[PDB]
Amino acid sequence: QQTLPVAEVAQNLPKKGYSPFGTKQSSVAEWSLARLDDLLNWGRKGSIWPLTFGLACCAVEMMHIAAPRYDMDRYGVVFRASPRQADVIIVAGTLTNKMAPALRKVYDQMPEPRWVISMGSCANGGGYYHYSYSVVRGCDRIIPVDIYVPGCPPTAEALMYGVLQLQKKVKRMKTLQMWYRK
Amino acid sequence: MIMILYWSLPMILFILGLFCFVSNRKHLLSMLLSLEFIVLMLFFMLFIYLNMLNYESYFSMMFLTFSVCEGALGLSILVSMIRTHGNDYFQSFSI
Amino acid sequence: MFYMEFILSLIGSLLLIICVLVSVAFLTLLERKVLGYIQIRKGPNKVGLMGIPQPFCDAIKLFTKEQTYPLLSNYLSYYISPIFSLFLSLFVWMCMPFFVKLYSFNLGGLFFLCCTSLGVYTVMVAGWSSNSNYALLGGLRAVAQTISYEVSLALILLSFIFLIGSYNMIYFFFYQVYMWFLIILFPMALVWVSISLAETNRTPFDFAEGESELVSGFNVEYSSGGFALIFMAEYASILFMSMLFCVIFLGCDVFNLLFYMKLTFISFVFIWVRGTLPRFRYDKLMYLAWKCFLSFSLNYLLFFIGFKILLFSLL
Amino acid sequence: RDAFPNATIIRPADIYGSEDRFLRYYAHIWRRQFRSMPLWHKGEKTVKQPVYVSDVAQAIINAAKDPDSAGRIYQAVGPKRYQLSELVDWFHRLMRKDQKRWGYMRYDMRWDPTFLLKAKLNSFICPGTPIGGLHPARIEREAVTDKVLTGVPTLEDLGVTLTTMEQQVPWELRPYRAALYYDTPSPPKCIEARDELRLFA
Amino acid sequence: MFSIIFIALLILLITTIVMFLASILSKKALIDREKSSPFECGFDPLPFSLRFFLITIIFLIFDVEIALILPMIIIMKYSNIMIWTITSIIFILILLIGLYHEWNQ
Amino acid sequence: MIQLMLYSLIITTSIIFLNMIHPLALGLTLLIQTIFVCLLTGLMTKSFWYSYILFLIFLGGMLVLFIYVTSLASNEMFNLSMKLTLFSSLILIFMLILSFIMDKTSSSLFLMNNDMQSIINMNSYFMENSLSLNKLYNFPTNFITILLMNYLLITLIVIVKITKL
Numbered sequence A: 001q002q003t004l005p006v007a008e009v010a011q012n013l014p015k016k017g018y019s020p021f022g023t024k025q026s027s028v029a030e031w032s033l034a035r036l037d038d039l040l041n042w043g044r045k046g047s048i049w050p051l052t053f054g055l056a057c058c059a060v061e062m063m064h065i066a067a068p069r070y071d072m073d074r075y076g077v078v079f080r081a082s083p084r085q086a087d088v089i090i091v092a093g094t095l096t097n098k099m100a101p102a103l104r105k106v107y108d109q110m111p112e113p114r115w116v117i118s119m120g121s122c123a124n125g126g127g128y129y130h131y132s133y134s135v136v137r138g139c140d141r142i143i144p145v146d147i148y149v150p151g152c153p154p155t156a157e158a159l160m161y162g163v164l165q166l167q168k169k170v171k172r173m174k175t176l177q178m179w180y181r182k
Numbered sequence B: 001m002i003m004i005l006y007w008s009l010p011m012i013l014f015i016l017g018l019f020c021f022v023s024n025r026k027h028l029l030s031m032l033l034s035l036e037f038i039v040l041m042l043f044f045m046l047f048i049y050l051n052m053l054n055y056e057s058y059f060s061m062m063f064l065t066f067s068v069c070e071g072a073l074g075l076s077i078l079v080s081m082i083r084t085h086g087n088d089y090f091q092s093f094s095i
Numbered sequence C: 001m002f003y004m005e006f007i008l009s010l011i012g013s014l015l016l017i018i019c020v021l022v023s024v025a026f027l028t029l030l031e032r033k034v035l036g037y038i039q040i041r042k043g044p045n046k047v048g049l050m051g052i053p054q055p056f057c058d059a060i061k062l063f064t065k066e067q068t069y070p071l072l073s074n075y076l077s078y079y080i081s082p083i084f085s086l087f088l089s090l091f092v093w094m095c096m097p098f099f100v101k102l103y104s105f106n107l108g109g110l111f112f113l114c115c116t117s118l119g120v121y122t123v124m125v126a127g128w129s130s131n132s133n134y135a136l137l138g139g140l141r142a143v144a145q146t147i148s149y150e151v152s153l154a155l156i157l158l159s160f161i162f163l164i165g166s167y168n169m170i171y172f173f174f175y176q177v178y179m180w181f182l183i184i185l186f187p188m189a190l191v192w193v194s195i196s197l198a199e200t201n202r203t204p205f206d207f208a209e210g211e212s213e214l215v216s217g218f219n220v221e222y223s224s225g226g227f228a229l230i231f232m233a234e235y236a237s238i239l240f241m242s243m244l245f246c247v248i249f250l251g252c253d254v255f256n257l258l259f260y261m262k263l264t265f266i267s268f269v270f271i272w273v274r275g276t277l278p279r280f281r282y283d284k285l286m287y288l289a290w291k292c293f294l295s296f297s298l299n300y301l302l303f304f305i306g307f308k309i310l311l312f313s314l315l
Numbered sequence D: 001r002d003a004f005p006n007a008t009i010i011r012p013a014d015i016y017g018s019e020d021r022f023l024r025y026y027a028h029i030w031r032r033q034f035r036s037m038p039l040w041h042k043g044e045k046t047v048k049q050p051v052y053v054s055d056v057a058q059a060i061i062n063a064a065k066d067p068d069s070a071g072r073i074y075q076a077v078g079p080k081r082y083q084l085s086e087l088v089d090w091f092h093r094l095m096r097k098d099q100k101r102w103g104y105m106r107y108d109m110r111w112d113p114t115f116l117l118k119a120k121l122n123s124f125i126c127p128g129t130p131i132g133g134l135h136p137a138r139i140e141r142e143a144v145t146d147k148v149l150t151g152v153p154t155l156e157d158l159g160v161t162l163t164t165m166e167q168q169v170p171w172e173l174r175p176y177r178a179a180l181y182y183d184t185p186s187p188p189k190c191i192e193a194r195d196e197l198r199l200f201a
Numbered sequence E: 001m002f003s004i005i006f007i008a009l010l011i012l013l014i015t016t017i018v019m020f021l022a023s024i025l026s027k028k029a030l031i032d033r034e035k036s037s038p039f040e041c042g043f044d045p046l047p048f049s050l051r052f053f054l055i056t057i058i059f060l061i062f063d064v065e066i067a068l069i070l071p072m073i074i075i076m077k078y079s080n081i082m083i084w085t086i087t088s089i090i091f092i093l094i095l096l097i098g099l100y101h102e103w104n105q
Numbered sequence F: 001m002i003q004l005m006l007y008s009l010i011i012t013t014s015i016i017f018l019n020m021i022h023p024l025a026l027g028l029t030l031l032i033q034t035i036f037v038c039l040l041t042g043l044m045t046k047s048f049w050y051s052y053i054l055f056l057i058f059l060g061g062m063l064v065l066f067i068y069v070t071s072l073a074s075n076e077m078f079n080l081s082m083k084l085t086l087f088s089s090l091i092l093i094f095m096l097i098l099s100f101i102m103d104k105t106s107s108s109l110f111l112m113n114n115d116m117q118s119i120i121n122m123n124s125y126f127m128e129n130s131l132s133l134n135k136l137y138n139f140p141t142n143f144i145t146i147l148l149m150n151y152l153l154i155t156l157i158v159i160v161k162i163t164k165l
């Protein structure tokens, strides 16, 4: 790892700023595309709409970020039932062999950009039914997954930590800078 | 003359809707929609007649009531063949 | 004919459209905020400062996502429903009672009934062109409830027009100079709230556009800008129903700031019934729209026929 | 081949499939012009031998595994030769464009400078990829017929069974079909060697 | 009414321009077989209903009936009072008797 | 001028109504024809009451039955052609420039509006939409509107019998 910086060292460090790219771009067109990508990523991270895809027990914790203690609504996060209106699909439960074409069709009808959160050990790696005859060995064999939330029923702080990690990934998305360098 | 410059267009579009009503290249739903097209043109020509008189425009909702009852009657005739002739009778080109 | 009338009418209508659209965005913010406060939870926060640019976060996201289609070959009929929906929601506002003259609508109630009668048309083209059985079911259910309370709404507003003696909306102001019509028309106030939550799809009448019995009624295939225009059109319909409640029952008070405070309060009431009531059924809603509200409409229309005849002899 | 001597060079002719630049390019609205497709010499002069993407992927893997394919050029072409007019007419028969109310018409491209002006403006105004791939390089690529070289190996020497066109292409063009007007398709005619020599004479 | 045409055409033009710019601003990805599919929950996939059609017909009959209840607010100060009262009471009373008879049968 | 614009729009929508065959597309052409017919009958009249009456009765009231039946009749979508759109736009621009090069005084309708009447006309100053609607609710023409309401109830009785429910 790295040691987290001591406050004597960290007082000499300057402020990071909001932009992961920095304001030190050379060209004015590159700087304008950087700020446009910053505004676009702020709009995308300011409201991600996850889809009501609750397969198994993990989803009982998924409603617990809907719950008044954790309150996902002040993070841009609000559930949508239709897959067209939703940004994120949260695979929260056990993907089985009869569940595989349904999950693939629901993911394919979702419009791009598409970030996928694997909630729980049945969602990533198979988990407690990994050696079962009718359980897919994780959802990574079917749906491409950006965030993997570890706990068997993830606490709801850990699922919301996965949500904040997805927001940091969305804030780190480089589209217009790649277009300028394509 | 007066007929050529005034109210010539409702006559022409009435004959066009009549020819769409009776053409063999259309279907029964097209006949009913062209029928309500000539109902609209009849309202246009009747209102041009009724506005030469000043305060007899109240007749416009009488003809409207009768022709709307005609249109609902035609739709209820046409969809009463759903349970008998099937759902494919709307594509019939001949009677 | 004097050209500054056209210039100022154009400027006032465009300013009305712009302010209605920004008030739609802040109404979505208000609904997400106080609808959270209906429960124990907080509203939006943590975006910008105290959650204020959250609808702009919605608008940047919805105008960037991939415009998907319910079929790949021909989808121009998919486009024409949110265009006409937002056009009607921004076009219905021209019959607002403006005391400084913008449009001299001597028949404003008929204009409102016309735009409400097109609401069925935009939701019918919303349902059919989305190529799904859920979409057709939601479109048929929305057309069913909106034409079921169209007749009731026409009779209720027709009973209200008997009080002012004409169809001019500004005539609601002169007959409210001593008291509001909330005192005299309180069962009509409850019935008009049940009407205004039925033409616009809200939670008490939500079998058309709910997330339980259908996943979405007619917004099921609409996304990435079309859903944004549909959402803005529906919240503009909510704003119009709040204004039209505040003109008829509460005193028109167009200039006073208390009128717009009451308009925000009736929007708060619309979000207050959004969080409270459950959803009616198809059979119970056919029972409500055609028997109870129709019988009350005809009966209390008879009451105002008798009352306007009784005052005509006395005056 | 000057830098890497033992480099395998697979030469595809024109690769068809899903999310391609052949069937989607002939499937787009921006390629057509008022329900009529312009083709160079009405599509009759050019003969193309297209190959599937799974066949060339299997050829790439069979070249990577077998080490006798070092520095050998492999002509990646399909099983049978087709001319472009019969291919485009077969595609429009698959998309249900053969109905008389659609108004399908095939005409000569060299009489129509408006199509090339549209292609140049489409290459100009698009910031990223042009819509439908209607850059003039694709125009010159569809103008150039597919010529195989004798004595240079074909993918059947790499041990892959080439999929025929009529098995795969209706599955690709099944979502591309038009809505039926309110008022099985015939397979296309292949072009042999003697018919191609008669056509090019 | 001529200003209403101009402002309605301007609202239509502004909404079509906003949707065209939204379609330009929408992120263009590769089109798919399954993405264009109509949404049925999960696994991939109505006849004529007479009850809803008679609901529309009842709505139409009551709408044309309301279109005759509409004028009489203006006429009340410009007509014979006895004739106006007799027609209004008879109109709404026959409507109420017909509604109650169709409820009971 | 705008009367000639509505003439041109009604001509263009009528010739595309003759051209097309898909039943919901003819229903859409009817619903967009009804607006222009309502406005054009509003140009001859003193006030826009009967245009509103035609609007609620025909478009929002009656044609929704036609839109529902034609929506459930056709499974397929519209096949939009840019040729018919281009021909409609070309004939529309041709007819608007033909109305530009034509004298609008001779082409205007002879039917009087509320402001085309005389200034000394006593009846025009009284109340908007009052004297035209008066004969609906006066002796002896009130029997027709009583018969009309009875006719609508009898129409509903007919429709329940013929659809067989």
Ligand code: SF4
Binding pocket: A056, A057, A058, A092, A093, A094, A119, A120, A121, A122, A123, A127, A128, A151, A152, A153, A154
């Ligand atoms: S990962 Fe654990 S909590 Fe989640 S569905 Fe599986 S067994 Fe249940």
